[PDB]
Amino acid sequence: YMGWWGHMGSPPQKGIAGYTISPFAARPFAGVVHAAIFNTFRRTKNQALFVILPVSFFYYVWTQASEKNEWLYTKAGRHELAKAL
Amino acid sequence: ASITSVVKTSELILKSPLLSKIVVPLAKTYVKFSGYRQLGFKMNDLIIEETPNMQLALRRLPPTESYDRVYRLIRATQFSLSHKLATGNDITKPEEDDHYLIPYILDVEAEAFEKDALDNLEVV
Amino acid sequence: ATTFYNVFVKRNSAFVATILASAFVFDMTFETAIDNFWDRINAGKQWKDIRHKY
Amino acid sequence: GKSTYKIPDFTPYLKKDRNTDANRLFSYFMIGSFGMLSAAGAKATVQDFLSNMSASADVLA
Amino acid sequence: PDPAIALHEAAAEGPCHDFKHHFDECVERVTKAQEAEDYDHAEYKEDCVEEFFHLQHCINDNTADKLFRVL
Amino acid sequence: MALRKKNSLLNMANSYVLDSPQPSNLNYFWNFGSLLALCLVIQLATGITLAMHYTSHASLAFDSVEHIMRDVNFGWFIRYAHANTASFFFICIYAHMGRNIYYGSYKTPRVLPWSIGVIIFLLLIITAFMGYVLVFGQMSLWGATVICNLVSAIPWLGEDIVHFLWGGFSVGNPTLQRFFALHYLMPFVLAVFALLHLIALHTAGSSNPLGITSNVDKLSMHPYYSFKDLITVFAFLLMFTLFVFFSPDKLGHPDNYIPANPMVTPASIVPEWYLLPFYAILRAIPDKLGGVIAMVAAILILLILPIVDRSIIRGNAFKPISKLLFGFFICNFLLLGVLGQVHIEPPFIVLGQICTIFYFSYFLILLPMVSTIENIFFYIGSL
Amino acid sequence: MTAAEHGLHPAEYPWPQNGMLSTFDHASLRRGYQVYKEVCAACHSLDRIAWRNLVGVTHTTDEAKAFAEELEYDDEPDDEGNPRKRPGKLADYIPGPYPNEQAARAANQGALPPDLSLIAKARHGGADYIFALLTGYPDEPPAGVVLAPGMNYNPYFPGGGIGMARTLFDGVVEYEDGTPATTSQMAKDVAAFLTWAAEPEHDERKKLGLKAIIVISAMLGLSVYIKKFKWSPIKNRKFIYNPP
Amino acid sequence: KNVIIKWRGKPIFIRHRTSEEIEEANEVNVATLRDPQTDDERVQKPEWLVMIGVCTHLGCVPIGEAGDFGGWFCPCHGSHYDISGRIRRGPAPLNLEIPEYDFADAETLVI
Ligand code: HEC
Ligand code: HEM
Ligand code: HEM
Ligand SMILES: CCCCCCCCCCCCO[C@@H]1O[C@H](CO)[C@@H](O[C@H]2O[C@H](CO)[C@@H](O)[C@H](O)[C@H]2O)[C@H](O)[C@H]1O
Ligand SMILES: CCCCCCCCCCCCO[C@@H]1O[C@H](CO)[C@@H](O[C@H]2O[C@H](CO)[C@@H](O)[C@H](O)[C@H]2O)[C@H](O)[C@H]1O
Ligand code: FES
Numbered sequence A: 001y002m003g004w005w006g007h008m009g010s011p012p013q014k015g016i017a018g019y020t021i022s023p024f025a026a027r028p029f030a031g032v033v034h035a036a037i038f039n040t041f042r043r044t045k046n047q048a049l050f051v052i053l054p055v056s057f058f059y060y061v062w063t064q065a066s067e068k069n070e071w072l073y074t075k076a077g078r079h080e081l082a083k084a085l
Numbered sequence B: 001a002s003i004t005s006v007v008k009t010s011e012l013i014l015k016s017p018l019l020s021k022i023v024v025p026l027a028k029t030y031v032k033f034s035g036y037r038q039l040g041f042k043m044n045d046l047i048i049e050e051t052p053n054m055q056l057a058l059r060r061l062p063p064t065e066s067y068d069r070v071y072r073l074i075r076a077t078q079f080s081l082s083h084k085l086a087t088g089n090d091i092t093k094p095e096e097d098d099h100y101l102i103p104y105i106l107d108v109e110a111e112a113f114e115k116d117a118l119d120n121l122e123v124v
Numbered sequence C: 001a002t003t004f005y006n007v008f009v010k011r012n013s014a015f016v017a018t019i020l021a022s023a024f025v026f027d028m029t030f031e032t033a034i035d036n037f038w039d040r041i042n043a044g045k046q047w048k049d050i051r052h053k054y
Numbered sequence D: 001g002k003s004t005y006k007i008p009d010f011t012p013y014l015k016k017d018r019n020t021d022a023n024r025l026f027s028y029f030m031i032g033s034f035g036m037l038s039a040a041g042a043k044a045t046v047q048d049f050l051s052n053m054s055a056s057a058d059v060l061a
Numbered sequence E: 001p002d003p004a005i006a007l008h009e010a011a012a013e014g015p016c017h018d019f020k021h022h023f024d025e026c027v028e029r030v031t032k033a034q035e036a037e038d039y040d041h042a043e044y045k046e047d048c049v050e051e052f053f054h055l056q057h058c059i060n061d062n063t064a065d066k067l068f069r070v071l
Numbered sequence F: 001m002a003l004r005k006k007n008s009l010l011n012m013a014n015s016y017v018l019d020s021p022q023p024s025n026l027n028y029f030w031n032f033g034s035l036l037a038l039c040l041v042i043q044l045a046t047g048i049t050l051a052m053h054y055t056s057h058a059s060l061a062f063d064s065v066e067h068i069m070r071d072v073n074f075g076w077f078i079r080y081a082h083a084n085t086a087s088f089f090f091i092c093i094y095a096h097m098g099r100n101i102y103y104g105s106y107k108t109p110r111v112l113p114w115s116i117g118v119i120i121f122l123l124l125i126i127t128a129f130m131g132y133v134l135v136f137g138q139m140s141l142w143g144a145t146v147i148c149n150l151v152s153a154i155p156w157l158g159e160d161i162v163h164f165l166w167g168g169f170s171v172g173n174p175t176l177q178r179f180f181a182l183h184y185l186m187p188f189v190l191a192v193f194a195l196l197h198l199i200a201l202h203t204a205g206s207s208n209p210l211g212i213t214s215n216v217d218k219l220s221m222h223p224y225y226s227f228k229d230l231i232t233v234f235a236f237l238l239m240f241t242l243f244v245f246f247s248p249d250k251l252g253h254p255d256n257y258i259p260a261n262p263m264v265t266p267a268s269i270v271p272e273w274y275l276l277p278f279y280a281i282l283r284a285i286p287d288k289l290g291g292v293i294a295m296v297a298a299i300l301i302l303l304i305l306p307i308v309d310r311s312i313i314r315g316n317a318f319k320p321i322s323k324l325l326f327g328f329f330i331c332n333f334l335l336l337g338v339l340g341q342v343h344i345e346p347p348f349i350v351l352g353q354i355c356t357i358f359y360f361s362y363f364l365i366l367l368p369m370v371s372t373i374e375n376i377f378f379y380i381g382s383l
Numbered sequence G: 001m002t003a004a005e006h007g008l009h010p011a012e013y014p015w016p017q018n019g020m021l022s023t024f025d026h027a028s029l030r031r032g033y034q035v036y037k038e039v040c041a042a043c044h045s046l047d048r049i050a051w052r053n054l055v056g057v058t059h060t061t062d063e064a065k066a067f068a069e070e071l072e073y074d075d076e077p078d079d080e081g082n083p084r085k086r087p088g089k090l091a092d093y094i095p096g097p098y099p100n101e102q103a104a105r106a107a108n109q110g111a112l113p114p115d116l117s118l119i120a121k122a123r124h125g126g127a128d129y130i131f132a133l134l135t136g137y138p139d140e141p142p143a144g145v146v147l148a149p150g151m152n153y154n155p156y157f158p159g160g161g162i163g164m165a166r167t168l169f170d171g172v173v174e175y176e177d178g179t180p181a182t183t184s185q186m187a188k189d190v191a192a193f194l195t196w197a198a199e200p201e202h203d204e205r206k207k208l209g210l211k212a213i214i215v216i217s218a219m220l221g222l223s224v225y226i227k228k229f230k231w232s233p234i235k236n237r238k239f240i241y242n243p244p
Numbered sequence H: 001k002n003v004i005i006k007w008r009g010k011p012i013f014i015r016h017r018t019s020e021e022i023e024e025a026n027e028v029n030v031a032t033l034r035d036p037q038t039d040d041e042r043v044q045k046p047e048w049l050v051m052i053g054v055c056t057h058l059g060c061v062p063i064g065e066a067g068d069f070g071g072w073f074c075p076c077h078g079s080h081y082d083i084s085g086r087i088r089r090g091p092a093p094l095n096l097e098i099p100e101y102d103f104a105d106a107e108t109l110v111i
Helices: A032-072 A078-084 B003-015 B017-034 B052-059 B063-082 B102-118 C002-009 C012-041 C047-053 D021-053 E003-013 E017-035 E049-061 E064-069 F008-017 F028-051 F061-070 F075-102 F111-133 F138-153 F158-166 F173-201 F221-246 F273-284 F288-308 F320-339 F348-381 G026-038 G061-069 G101-106 G127-135 G183-198 G202-235 H019-025
Strands: A016-019 F021-023 F218-220 G072-074 G085-087 G238-241 H002-007 H010-016 H048-052 H072-074 H079-081 H087-089
Touching: A016 B063, A032 A078, A032 F320, A032 F348, B003 B017, B003 B102, B003 F348, B017 F320, B017 F348, B052 B102, B063 G202, B063 G238, C002 C012, C002 D021, C012 D021, C012 G202, C047 G026, D021 F028, D021 F075, D021 G202, E003 E017, E003 E049, E003 E064, E003 G183, E017 E049, F008 F221, F021 F221, F028 F075, F028 F173, F028 F221, F061 F075, F075 F111, F075 F221, F075 F273, F075 F320, F075 G202, F111 F138, F111 F173, F111 F273, F111 F288, F138 F158, F138 F173, F138 F288, F158 F173, F218 F221, F221 G202, F273 F288, F273 F320, F273 F348, F288 F348, F320 F348, G026 G183, G127 G183
Parallel strands: none
Antiparallel strands: A016 G238, F021 F218, G072 G085, H002 H010, H010 H048, H072 H079, H079 H087
């Protein structure tokens, strides 16, 4: 499924012109400030829900479970603990 | 899964009025949130191609379609490495998201599945 | 500045020799500098600071 | 979008002084600094690490 | 004399007063309950450890930094 | 023709580290491969060094580790480096497996590197378990006791097999000496399998975060990924430095600084943090043998991802629903980890079972369902 | 578990050695050795510490040799193969108060006082636990706690009933540097000493960490410049497509 | 009388229990026992209480004959075991473990 340089196994390419400039001719950090602020905000915003939803749910679950467990092993929780065992 | 399976199931849904009424709007939003259009891909560009069947279907593409596919993949790869999105004409509009490959893969698979069936025929 | 490039950078043999000689200098000076800094932030705490009592 | 002799716009990234010795020298100063700290770090790493094989404090007692 | 003694007393009367009083009231209840007969043949014997821990935890939060400052 | 291509030996190196054609869009999660290689090298160097100072006999083992800490020049560093890198090895391996699951690296044509990878993961677990025993502190002994007794669950022969592992009737000197020998060996076996999974991968090349072919746009492994790998090497070393130099015992259990005592049983016997999810899975099943099977199945079920993922699309970059499901799966795996170190008490007992059900239902139900649905949505959605 | 069964968790005290750049206070270490020597050593061994380990940490070579030479250690047998004693040397380990575990337990109503060489690493809390435990014997157990005979109530110890009685009282030690020997002072000093005993490399380790952090940070900064420099041809690449 | 045989480092309490001792042990309602077990489960022979003589709390050896249930009392944290060697009072969670022992003869046991 992959070849090697010269015969990589690409469908025939035609009609694309690629251009680039030397590493010595470019500013490596061109537009870094804009990217660091605006680009990162865009990328983070677009992914935020996929992180926040599961983290918040499982943190809530853990919080409820740890708080119940703590309460069951108090004096006040004696009866509820007796039933739970 | 096979593309044949996906296409047949989708046709069952589009037939049923009730089902299409509830599925088609969902699928349109899904595709909007999927975000592949923001890298200038058409849906079909994303189908896994490292299978014998898909290699054969890609070899059957008309040269123009094939050349354009190569460009879209290269362009998307450049957006990906740059962490940029397509803008302007590079964004795939819904009308440009044509199923250019589905007919070819459906034909390749049709023959391969007929071959499997007929390899199991029993003279009655 | 051309001169500096030509002497220390152009030949890789020269560049590697410059890097290693700089590493030698850095290593010796950094050691000394950190020693002094460490002694100032931990002043009166270290054995060297109380040793004189004994 | 058609002529391939019309080089795309690279003005956002081109350095005006790109062919000067100053320009090259600076990038090699970064490469060289990195080589220098790698050399100093490797020397410290190797020296400290191999010293485990010299006589331990209980043996020297 | 031990700096801790003074700091602990001050923190109990001041910022940890609620917990001090909880512990006190607990002690009163338990001692009174031990005074009553057929206490030894009871199922559940209440202690004051919980209240003690709440008080000590509080005192320690208000004292730790102060104590180490005067050593 | 250039020597690096002409000479057979050089050409093998060249094919892996220099001319190797890589996708030009690998993101930083493709850097875990090299970090795992770095961990493996650090573990070999520090491990072989500790072996020069460690004594495997149970009468001397714990004391030899104290001798390393106290008397050997830089012994403290070599010991802490070895112990902490064992933790980082698992952080990187979970990251690497996470990358592989999210981006569909397990799909055809990469089932073979994935499957060999699952075995590497098992060897890493065995290696790290045995290494922990070698300290012969309280957690070393009691961890060995508890974990080796799980083999007693094997019907008919279980008891006999445990005595055979131990070389005796409890964990003791014979066990310690044999774990030393095997712990020394296992990293070399693990290095071999790591090399096999690479050779297997080299037929398809690396996947990439878009999940499309990269055959159209390749970049040499060097210099581009060489220099990009340095960034994460230095980031890794900074994290390594903060643990090894400034908080060397943050990831440890204090009880392992008490010499093993077969009479005194520690407060709570837990495995090292990186085994905790599997421990939680075991506790979830009440049956002893059931528990063991589930625990092994939790690892071996990874082998069926190639089958149960029915998507026509490789990886999750474009699949909002799969991304949500993946997020929940990963967080649940972390919850399992947490529940592995709580006491067997309400309400964590029931919660552990629910998380275990969620863990397996991802592979068996949700991923097959979700991947089938998204196939249909992509097709109908783009009509 | 009940909080009692866990033990009260010790406060976080601001130790001199807390702090990425902070060593032990060696004056405190020396005072803490004197507390170990005059109070704890009656019951607790410090087997992993040799006299030489004190040198250039708490004591000069001469002071430490003096401490070693005051003791008798087992020599190699004489020429008739009879056992012999010799005076201690710097290479000798600080000797324990009891010949074996059985003798230790017999002297402590069955409890075995642990070796203290590693106790700062072997308990959650470290210095803070040792300080909290030594200073945390209340005058009276919380009402309703039933102590087993020969146990003492201490909330920091798991279960609450500890076989070690309170031992630090104002002026049990006379410090040689004129520091007032209050319960708190002695606990702080001995806790610092024991922390040093557990991790004697601590001071050197943190200094080498400082050097590492600095070099590794610089290399990380430079590696980012170099990556960006070498990658710029790929990031900056532009395409023109003319469909054929 | 109660003997102490070391066996795999762990001490083994061997008590030659009297008739009335056996009776005393067979009384306690199993219900009220941290670790619920009857003497019958523990011994294979009522006249030979053989146990692993380490306290199940931390791991001192209980002083026999002492206690409050007159069996074994761990002096370390004050846990009381019975004439069955069952835990009755104190921090210890479990009853004193029983080794695998067999009566080869009626006058010799192997452990
Ligand atoms: C005369 C007896 C005695 C003296 C004096 C003594 N201890 Fe102890 N210590 C014990 C005994 C016995 C235990 C075990 C208690 C138990 O396990 O119930 C112990 C336990 C400890 C523990 C650990 C408790 C645990 O978590 O297991 C520390 C730490 C400790 N001692 C430190 C000291 C320090 C510091 C001093 C004095 C500066 C000191 N001891 C003085 C008898 C003593
Ligand atoms: C010592 C442990 C390991 C080492 C050193 C290692 C190293 C690597 C390296 C260098 C690569 C290529 C670059 C990269 O993608 O990061 C790679 C790819 C891969 N590894 Fe690992 N690996 C290890 C363990 C594992 C494990 C446990 C798995 C799976 C469970 C695994 C599955 C894979 C797969 C599927 C790929 C191809 C991914 C892709 O590029 O799309 N490896 N590994
Ligand atoms: C994948 C590679 C390895 C892993 C994951 C690994 C893991 C571990 C772990 C977790 C420990 C317990 C450390 C502690 O808490 O002190 C350890 C100890 C040890 N390992 Fe390894 N190890 C590896 C490779 C090696 C190798 C190759 C050797 C060569 C002999 C080795 C020798 C030792 C020795 C001698 C100890 C005991 C001394 C000690 O505890 O520090 N290890 N290892
Ligand atoms: C091909 C490679 C060449 C051979 C490699 C040589 C390996 C061993 C050589 C030196 C090892 C011992 O050499 C010794 O190193 C240690 C640091 O490790 C230095 O020691 C210095 O720093 C350490 C901690 O960093 C302190 O404990 C010490 O008090 C201080 O003097 C000594 O000043 C040096 O004399
Ligand atoms: C990772 C550390 C570096 C050491 C190298 C790893 C050791 C593993 C190497 C032995 C495995 C065989 O490696 C195999 O060899 C040949 C040539 O070398 C490669 O062959 C590839 O490159 C050569 C030229 O570079 C071409 O002739 C060939 O058409 C192409 O497929 C295979 O793609 C690779 O799978
Ligand atoms: S040690 Fe047996 S009572 Fe605590």
